[PDB]
């Protein structure tokens, strides 16, 4: 349901450099390190990305801090997650994000991840809760407050838990990709690393499950599980994963590349004149010389229409609404 968690928005994030961390895995075949020109949509490097503060835990006084936002989707996003103590329990999607369009529910649970496609009455900011009992120590039953109006639901799927739980920060990173027809899931859980940037190395973003739905998807919201109380905003007192719950949002754009003791990956896009030269020669090393790459042309600045000075209209109704032929 709606416990309304829209916040008049607090202290903004910086946009820190993404080094690579973003190459997923195409195909099942048996070659080793074969310099492979296949074509699929991958991550641009050393441009802008964004992360955000998940539960921006203050010092002595603050506010209540659930600020999980609704974003558009450019048909594929690299996701990353510094968080280790499993507050991310799913994602929700929709174009209208209402009961007009069937809407993707993907929601993680203690023994499965439920996958659902159904037009739900969305709460504007729902939340999930993981607490502590007094009697049992860690009984982690999860209260799913995100789906309300189960009208025309067809898709039901039981899987393994996607995020599972060991001292240092485990990056549990994802590539999702809206394609019409089939929808693609590409994920990695790294081992333990202390980098307060997005942690170092490449990603072995392995595929786990496929969704054969492939509808229109326009807009995005991920899920955070926190036992937030109703009671005191200054004494908020949840205190689960203060500051390391920061999750990182990529983007994709049409762009071409090369793959690689096995095959891994690389590139093939034209951005500067040097990569234009590497595009036209189809070669990563280019030797010394003058090379005719492409062609320039002076562009149209505006448009004009030149039509003569006539005012009256043509007699259509003098035959089409006339007497007879």
């Amino acid at each position: 349901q709606c416990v309304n968690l829209t916040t008049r928005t607090q202290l903004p994030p910086a946009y820190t450099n993404s080094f690579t961390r973003g190459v997923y895995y195409p195909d099942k075949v048996f070659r080793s390190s074969v310099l492979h020109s296949t074509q699929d949509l991958f991550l641009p490097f050393f441009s802008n990305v964004t992360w955000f503060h998940a539960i921006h835990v203050s010092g002595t006084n603050g506010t209540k801090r659930f600020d999980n936002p609704v974003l558009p989707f450019n048909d594929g996003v690299y996701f990353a997650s510094t968080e280790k103590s499993n507050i991310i329990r799913g994602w929700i999607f929709g174009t209208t994000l209402d009961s007009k369009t069937q809407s993707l529910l993907i929601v993680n649970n203690a023994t499965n991840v439920v996958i659902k496609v159904c037009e739900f009455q969305f709460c504007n900011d729902p939340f999930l809760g993981v607490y502590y009992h007094k009697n049992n120590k860690s009984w982690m039953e999860s209260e799913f407050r995100v789906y309300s109006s189960a009208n025309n639901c067809t898709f039901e799927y039981v899987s393994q838990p996607f995020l599972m739980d060991g001292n240092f920060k485990n990056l549990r990173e994802f590539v999702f990709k809206n394609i019409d027809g089939y929808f693609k899931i590409y994920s990695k859980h790294t081992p333990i690393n202390l980098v307060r940037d997005l942690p170092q190395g490449f990603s072995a973003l392995e595929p786990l499950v496929d969704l054969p739905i492939g509808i229109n998807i326009t807009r995005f919201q991920t899920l955070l599980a926190l036992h937030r109380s109703y009671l005191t905003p200054g004494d908020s007192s949840s205190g689960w994963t203060a500051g390391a719950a920061a999750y990182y949002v990529g983007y994709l754009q049409p762009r071409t590349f090369l793959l690689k003791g096995t095959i891994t990956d690389a590139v093939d896009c034209a951005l500067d004149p040097l990569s234009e030269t590497k595009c036209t020669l189809k070669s990563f090393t280019v030797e010394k010389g003058i090379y005719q790459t492409s062609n320039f042309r002076v562009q149209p600045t505006e448009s004009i229409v030149r039509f003569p000075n006539i005012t009256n209209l043509c007699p259509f109704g003098e035959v089409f609404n006339a007497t007879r032929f």
Partner: antibody
Amino acid sequence: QVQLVESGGGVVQPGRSLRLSCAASGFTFSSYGMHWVRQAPGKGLEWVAVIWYDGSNKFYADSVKGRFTISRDNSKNTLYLQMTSLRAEDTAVYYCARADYGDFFFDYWGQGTLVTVSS
Amino acid sequence: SYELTQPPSVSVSPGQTARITCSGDALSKHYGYWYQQKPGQAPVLVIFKDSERPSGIPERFSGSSSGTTITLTVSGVQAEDEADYYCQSADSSATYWVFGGGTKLTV
């Protein structure tokens, strides 16, 4: 210490809007979410209603949901309301409640507004 | 939420004080509390988090939370013991509070 100076209990028809008060003493006002606990004379206590600190969500209990609107305003320095279309249920001693999150407790209890319908 | 299980009236008078038993499976998720109704109709909290009494309290006992039921905060009796108790076992994050009809304490 906090003791909730609330008054203005008085004459109302059944099915009539009375705008009862819960003014406060002691505590800061946009950092506590104040509850409401009722008590009929002759029965025990029961929780009824609670808001947040800017009128974002307004929870009521499982039998009285939607029929009240408790709210706040930072200039008026009361707690105004309309009880809307009672079904001979508002014969009690209303209280507010300040909670301070010692795992969902209540700390201090005021004097008590009493509103009565005449049957 | 649904109402807590309570005894309506316990009448006892030796010097040994019998414990009021409050039962239910909802005390594991958030746990059973105690609310007074003093002479004067001025309730106070006397014991919170099942463990600690606040500052300047008339000093009595506390709770232990042995499993399902909790033994309460009552110590050896004075002449001011007319006031009674309210079980209050809360929920996790839907945040419903049920007090019940309460107890009585009369020697």
